[PDB]
Design a protein around this ligand. Sequence first.
Ligand SMILES: [Cl-]
Ligand SMILES: [Cl-]
Length: 162
Amino acid sequence: MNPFEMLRIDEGLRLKIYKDTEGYYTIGIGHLLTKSPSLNAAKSELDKAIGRNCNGVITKDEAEKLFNQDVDAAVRGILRNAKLKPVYDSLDAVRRCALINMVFQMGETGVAGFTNSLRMLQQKRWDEAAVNLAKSRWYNQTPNRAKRVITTFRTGTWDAYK
Ligand SMILES: [Cl-]
Ligand SMILES: [Cl-]
């Protein structure tokens, strides 16, 4: 297990544009295209992301690529964020995967918002942090996935992913 396999499990892989759990246009491995309702605004975004006329369809290789960009960006924003960095640095290797996962899904800004959970993780209060993370729209909206990440923070193992 690693951050890539982890996210691959959680996001899946789709080669035609689809609508995510929030009803937004996405493609590949959780690559948001646009928050706009317009199928056309998405197809445009697609083409500019990929560098070809895609006609809303892409290849495995092309999804893998955007994915690689997206992970790197998640990591680079954790590192750049004053609230996120100290947490990430304090965590072990497994738990680092879980913060990457949340950042990818909700963005740096969104996660930095979880002030209290962040403090508890940094302080290594696992049980507490897991109870607190669960009191969130995030948990209520995608409970199977939040449960996976939460257990990851809780136990520091990949069990929820096996
Ligand atoms: Cl709640
Ligand atoms: Cl879910």
